[PDB]
Amino acid sequence: MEELTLTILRQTGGLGISIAGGKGSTPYKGDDEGIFISRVSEEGPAARAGVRVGDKLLEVNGVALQGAEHHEAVEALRGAGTAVQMRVWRERETSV
Template sequence: MSKINGNNARLCHIVKRDHFDGYGFNLHAEKGKSGQYIGKVDKDSPAEAAGLRQGDRILEVNGVPIANKTHKQVVEAIKAEQDETKLLVIDPDDEDRPDVTKTPEKSSPKEENKKGNQEANGPLNLNMTAAELRATLASKKKFDPKKESMDFKKKFDIVQKL
């Protein structure tokens, strides 16, 4: 572990495996906080094996600081090398943040409100693995009419209606 600005930082070298889809973690921003954070880390994933933990804040991707980068730029940096990536991260405890991996024994009013919203809006699975999330999103891809092949007569009819 190395010290960065008085904080303990870890370098996680994540290497893809043939039998595992992706690195096995989600990346997100946190409202009111700068930077990018590690969301869910899949069990038995390359990310878990490399020591990545839920709640870690990313400082560098492949040796490049990401402080002023957008979410999209950080994702692109992670994907820049095909089969591996190196993330320099800070543990949430070193940033005076609560440990997001602990499950509260008693629900807070905010969690009770979330449960109410889940019942009103249908099931919301927040415990999905990254692989399950990718599969769900892929199955819900929207129809793109621009990609539909259309014969000339049909196009002509549409233009005439305008």
Template sequence: MAFQHQPGTAMQCLSIPIKLAKEVGIDSEGREVMKCGFKIGGGIDQDFTRSPQGYTDNGIYVTEVYESSPAAKCGLKVHDKILQVNGYDFTMVTHKKAVEYIKKHPVLNMLIARKGVTHS
């Protein structure tokens, strides 16, 4: 079960593969940046009991997806739990490390868990 998972313990769940290719955009200072179009919350360094979204574990969750963004186009949804990005385990990661890893790569090959999805 992907939700209510304790970091460091074995987990069996259905994972959905999502490939997100970032798009070039311009930031507020006129610099070219790679944009993915989503925000995350959570991490092993966060207290999930204080999550405004009501998450039940320390996983990395998608908390916002911007309309018409690469994230929206590839099918990422709010409340998706990110299990892995480019082969890197996101079940045992701090919030800061997850943000840094996502920012670093132009293409994100993710495995996510989605509540209510029990088979493909």
């Protein structure tokens, strides 16, 4: 399963993740300007939904985040509603 779809029920104090990257923002990696999950709260909603650090954000509640700006991604995550559907790309292994 390289792409996954995860459902996060929003809660007091947010989804429990941090995101990094996006077009024009400091990149998370050297070969990808995309939006990545840079941190997952151990005890937060996203962790319980199965989200993992390093996941690349592809879509949030239907909003495509490929080639998106950091700001658009933050806005989609912050305004998405009681539940958030997140489509991510997951690498089990990284070529170096």
